[PDB]
A paper describes a structure:
Here, we isolate anti-RBD nanobodies from llamas and from mice that we engineered to produce VHHs cloned from alpacas, dromedaries and Bactrian camels. To define the region bound by nanomouse nanobodies, we collected single-particle cryo-electron microscopy data on a Titian Krios for Nb12 and [name] in complex with HexaPro, a prefusion construct of the [name]-[name]-2 spike. By contrast, both nanomouse Nb12 and [name] recognize RBD at a surface outside the ACE2-binding site. Second, nanobodies isolated from nanomice (Nb12 and [name]) associate with an RBD region that is highly conserved among sarbecoviruses, but remains inaccessible to most human antibodies.
To refine the list of candidates, we measured RBD-binding affinity by biolayer interferometry. This analysis identified 4 nanobodies from llama (designed nanobody (Nb) 15, Nb17, Nb19 and Nb56) and 2 nanobodies from nanomouse (Nb12 and [name]) with dissociation constants below 30 nM. The structure of the Nb12–spike complex revealed Nb12 to induce a two-RBD-up, one-RBD-down spike conformation, with Nb12 recognizing a region towards the middle of the RBD, outside of the ACE2-binding region and distal from the residues (417, 484 and 501) affected in emerging variants of concern. The structure of the [name]–spike complex revealed [name] to induce a three-RBD-up conformation, with [name] recognizing a region at the opposite end of RBD from the ACE2-binding motif and residues affected by escape mutations. To understand how the two nanomouse nanobodies neutralized despite recognizing surfaces outside the ACE2-binding domain, we superimposed the structure of the ACE2–RBD complex with those of Nb12 and [name]. With [name], we observed a subtler clash with glycan N322 on ACE2, which nonetheless also indicated that [name] and ACE2 binding are sterically incompatible. However, the [name] binding footprint is farther away from the ACE2 RBD motif and covers a surface area that is 79% conserved among sarbecoviruses, including [name]-[name], [name]-[name]-2 and bat coronaviruses (compared to 54% for Nb12 and, on average, 23% for human antibodies). By contrast, the regions recognized by Nb12 and [name] were conserved in sarbecoviruses and displayed a substantially lower prevalence of human antibody recognition. In contrast to llama nanobodies, the neutralization potencies of nanomouse Nb12 and [name] were largely unaltered by RBD mutations, which suggests that they recognize a region that is different from the receptor-binding motif. Similarly, [name]–RBD interfered with Nb12 binding, whereas llama nanobodies bound freely to it. We conclude that nanomouse VHHs circumvent RBD antigenic drift by recognizing a sarbecoviral conserved region outside the ACE2-binding motif.
Residue numbers in the entry:
A (entry chain C): 943 to 991
B (entry chain A): 2 to 52, 52A, 53 to 82, 82A, 82B, 82C, 83 to 100, 100A, ...
C (entry chain B): 299 to 676, 691 to 694
D (entry chain C): 26 to 66, 79 to 141, 153 to 174, 186 to 246, 262 to 298
Write the structure that this text describes.
């Protein structure tokens, strides 16, 4: 654990960045989290919602 | 009831034609339509079909490669592109409508007939 | 650079002006080796189809039944796909893929339609309102017409109540119309309902039977079984392409793989759950997926008051596809001199255009990165 | 009836994704670690389905031949059936009726009631190996997972870890509440039954995408 102070920062950054990418797979209330499914299975007047 | 045709086999050389029909007697967006042909040696042979909405269509065996159909939901008119004419296609074509569509011996109204003469 | 700084003079330095991204070309599609081939062929190529009194709601499930052969079958007259346009039948099916057939008499084919009663739509077969499926009537004289008439398909010409839509009505008892009872021995009010289609060669096309089959498509909470086939192109490699395998879609570059799936996985993910490998449904081969190249573009300038030359850095990109990365053939002839030339240098930071490499070493003037700097010596050097 | 322990058995691949040298946490219907499961071993009672079923068996002779599934198990409503005939597997969903005691040099077919109103069929090809199966039924689909393993032990479920690879899904699209086993009679078996419920697991994928270990996130505080 000698170089813990140098390790911690690395770890922190990595995990924060990881938490960003995973956040890209959440609905937030929509019907799907993948954009082409909304663009395909729905109509322009209401897909925008 | 007022089913009219157009065109005319005036081919000074190799060329095509268009049949412009119109059901100016009844409603145009309720009855599915078909164009038929009369060779001098044959009967009112089926050529092309088209739906009530102008989408469902499937040509006959003889004309599924070159002879294009189209009809309009409004405007009461309808067209058939008679592209790359053939002498066997020198015929009296009848635009006509019915409840169904496609090679019906009986139909609601037949056209006035266009005697297109694909010449050489 | 002048437009992004909103100035008419720029100081010596390195500025970032825009991004860039390679664009897809082919948009390929791959789907499984369909080869499932419903046995509709006989119920297209048999000699005696169902009977209007005994037209079974035959449940044919779990296979592909192509209809393109129907569209180009060169026999149809009143082929009509209600609900969905026939041209878009093979692409998309519906659940409840039940199937029906008969060789009907064609004098009332136009009576067989949704929302239209009549005689055949009354005693023989009725279409429910808003029909979702295909009723297909075509010419079948040459086979179902024997000498003196093919009396092989009788028909119930009498029924107590108008048929419920989609009801195969089979019965032996005779029509009731009066009050005086038939004594089994046929009387004056017996009225044998199962009359016989006169299907003679003497009949015309309408009088002769149009064969009508019914691909009915309902909506029940049961999995769909039979649908039309799917087309699929061939596959390209080592090109930024759009792709859609059997269900999942994306854009990227597909390359040969070194990993090894188990015999039942289809694709593969990594940490953070991004798909990065796939198996082609028709060859059982694993392909790696890589994003199409993207990055930023920066401009190195020695200051407006000093000179008027520039150099361009495309960050972390192999220094070959720059004229395709930016749409160089669309830009002005003055941009085009900065997408290729004699001075092309590959650094750990990217692709550098417009400056010449030198073996000498000086103090850093403009930082490019990874130990590389650039400056002006009258020409830009790196 | 002479229960026994479940030493970390009954783990199956939850989907068709490939993963390499990773730990992945999932939530699904599983068999909890260290439970007591009924042990029949001559035995053929009615047992409820309850959201899914684990099933192990070890037998030298081929006594166990298949299974019966359904809701009412009579002429009224549709049922489902799997049978092995030593060369082929018959799977049917026909409308049978009840049999107070179905069972099978060979005398067999004593299970048969009648076969009116069929709606699907999937004839296919098929101290002894412990044979393990997992049955689920959801979204109109019926899913089966299985595994076979050499065994050297008596009367006991072996310890250790091994995963249940899928082998079939069926678009049966029916409902189901209880089931039966099928044994061939010819004048030594083993017959375990457990149950599944919605519990969260953590799974380990090695360098080749094989599940080699798991932990149950509700067995212990240390597991939590
Ligand atoms: C998909 O169908 C094609 C059509 O034949 C199969 O292609 C052949 O596959 C064999 C191996 O099974 C090769 O030896 C041949 O050279 C292939 N020929 C052609 C023209 O493709 C293919 O194997 C099938 N794939 C699957 C997964 O069933
Ligand atoms: C029926 O058979 C004929 C000739 O045997 C063939 O041309 C036709 O394509 C077959 N029907 C279908 C639907 O393929
Ligand atoms: C331009 O200005 C910069 C700093 O403002 C200076 O260093 C440079 O020498 C000037 N060039 C000329 C040609 O005067
Ligand atoms: C850059 O592209 C060239 C052209 O094929 C290739 O030979 C070289 O290996 C590539 N290098 C890198 C670092 O991408
Ligand atoms: C610079 O160094 C390279 C690397 O060996 C060499 O090929 C070249 O001749 C040297 N001189 C010049 C002027 O580039
Ligand atoms: C073992 O089985 C007995 C029998 O009912 C039960 O009481 C007990 O809870 C089981 N053990 C565990 C750990 O569930
Ligand atoms: C046969 O099974 C179908 C499928 O559910 C059902 O609709 C029908 O009523 C059944 N008929 C008989 C006679 O069991
Ligand atoms: C099965 O039966 C239950 C009640 O007995 C019913 O609620 C459910 O909808 C049925 N499911 C199917 C698929 O028939
Ligand atoms: C993975 O597979 C390779 C060969 O396919 C094998 O050499 C290696 O031992 C395997 N890894 C494990 C952990 O079994």
């Amino acid at each position: 654990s000698a170089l813990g102070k140098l390790q911690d920062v690395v770890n922190q950054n990595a995990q924060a960045l990881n938490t960003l990418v995973k956040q890209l797979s959440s609905n937030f209330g929509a019907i799907s989290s993948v954009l082409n499914d909304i663009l395909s299975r729905l109509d322009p007047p209401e897909a925008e919602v | 009831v007022q089913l009219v045709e157009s065109g005319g086999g005036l081919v000074q050389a190799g060329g095509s034609l268009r049949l412009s029909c119109a059901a100016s007697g009844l409603t145009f967006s309720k009855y599915a339509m078909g164009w038929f042909r009369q060779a001098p040696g044959k009967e009112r042979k089926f050529v092309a079909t088209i739906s009530w909405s102008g989408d469902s269509a499937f040509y006959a065996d003889s004309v599924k490669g070159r002879f294009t159909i189209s009809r309009d939901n409004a405007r009461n008119t309808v067209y058939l592109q008679m592209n790359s004419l053939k002498p066997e296609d020198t015929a009296v074509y009848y635009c006509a409508a019915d409840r169904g569509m496609g090679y019906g011996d009986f139909m609601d109204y037949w056209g006035q007939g266009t005697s297109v003469t694909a010449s050489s | 650079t002048k437009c992004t700084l909103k100035s008419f003079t720029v100081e010596k330095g390195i500025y970032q002006t825009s991004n860039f991204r390679v664009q897809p070309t082919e948009s390929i599609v791959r789907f499984p080796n369909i080869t499932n081939l419903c046995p509709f062929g006989e119920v297209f190529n048999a000699t005696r189809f169902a009977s209007v009194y005994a037209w079974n709601r035959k449940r044919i499930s779990n296979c592909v039944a192509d209809y393109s052969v129907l569209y180009n079958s060169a026999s149809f007259s009143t082929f009509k796909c209600y609900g969905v346009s026939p041209t878009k039948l093979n692409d998309l099916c519906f659940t409840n893929v039940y199937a029906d057939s008969f060789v009907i008499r064609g004098d009332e084919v136009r009576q067989i339609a949704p929302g239209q009663t009549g005689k055949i739509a009354d005693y023989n077969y009725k279409l429910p309102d808003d029909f979702t499926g295909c009723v297909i009537a075509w010419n079948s004289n040459n086979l179902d017409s024997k000498v003196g008439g093919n009396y092989n398909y009788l028909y119930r010409l009498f029924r107590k109540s108008n048929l419920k839509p989609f009801e195969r009505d089979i019965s032996t008892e005779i029509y009731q119309a009066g009050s005086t009872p038939c004594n089994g021995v046929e009387g004056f009010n017996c009225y044998f309902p199962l009359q016989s289609y006169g299907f003679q060669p003497t009949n015309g096309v309408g009088y002769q039977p149009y064969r009508v089959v019914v691909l009915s498509f309902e909506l029940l909470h049961a999995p769909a079984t039979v649908c039309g086939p799917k087309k699929s192109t061939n596959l390209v490699k080592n090109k930024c392409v759009n792709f859609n395998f059997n269900g999942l879609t994306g854009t990227g570059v597909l390359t040969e793989s070194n990993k090894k799936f188990l015999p039942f996985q289809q694709f593969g993910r990594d940490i953070a759950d991004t798909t990065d490998a796939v198996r082609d449904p028709q060859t059982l081969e694993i392909l790696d997926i890589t994003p199409c190249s993207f990055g930023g573009v920066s401009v190195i300038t020695p200051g407006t008051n000093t000179s008027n030359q520039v150099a361009v850095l495309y960050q972390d990109v192999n220094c070959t596809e720059v004229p395709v990365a930016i749409h160089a053939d669309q830009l002005t002839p003055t941009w085009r001199v900065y997408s290729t030339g004699s001075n092309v240098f590959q650094t750990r930071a990217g692709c550098l255009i417009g400056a010449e490499h030198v073996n000498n070493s000086y103090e850093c003037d403009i930082p490019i990165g990874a130990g590389i700097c650039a400056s002006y010596q009258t020409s830009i050097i790196a | 009836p002479a229960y026994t322990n479940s030493f970390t058995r009954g783990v199956y691949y939850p989907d068709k994704v490939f993963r390499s040298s990773v730990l992945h946490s999932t939530q699904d219907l599983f068999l909890p670690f260290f439970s007591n499961v009924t042990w029949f071993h001559f035995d053929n009672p009615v047992l409820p389905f309850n959201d899914g079923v684990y099933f192990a068996s070890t037998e030298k002779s081929n006594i166990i031949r298949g299974w019966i599934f359904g809701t009412t198990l009579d002429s009224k409503t549709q049922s489902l059936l799997i049978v092995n005939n030593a060369t082929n597997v018959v799977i049917k969903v026909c409308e049978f009726q009840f049999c107070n005691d179905p069972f099978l040099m060979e005398s067999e077919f004593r299970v048969y009631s009648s076969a009116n109103n069929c709606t699907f069929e999937y004839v296919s090809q098929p101290f002894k190996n412990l044979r393990e199966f997992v049955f689920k039924n959801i979204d109109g689909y019926f899913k089966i997972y299985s595994k076979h393993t050499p065994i050297n032990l008596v009367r006991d479920l072996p310890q250790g870890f091994s995963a249940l690879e899928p082998l079939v899904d069926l678009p049966i699209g029916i409902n189901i509440t209880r089931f039966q086993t099928l044994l061939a009679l010819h004048r030594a078996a083993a017959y375990y039954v457990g149950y599944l419920q919605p519990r969260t697991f953590l799974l380990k994928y090695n360098e080749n995408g094989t599940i080699t270990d798991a932990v149950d996130c509700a067995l212990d505080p240390l597991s939590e």
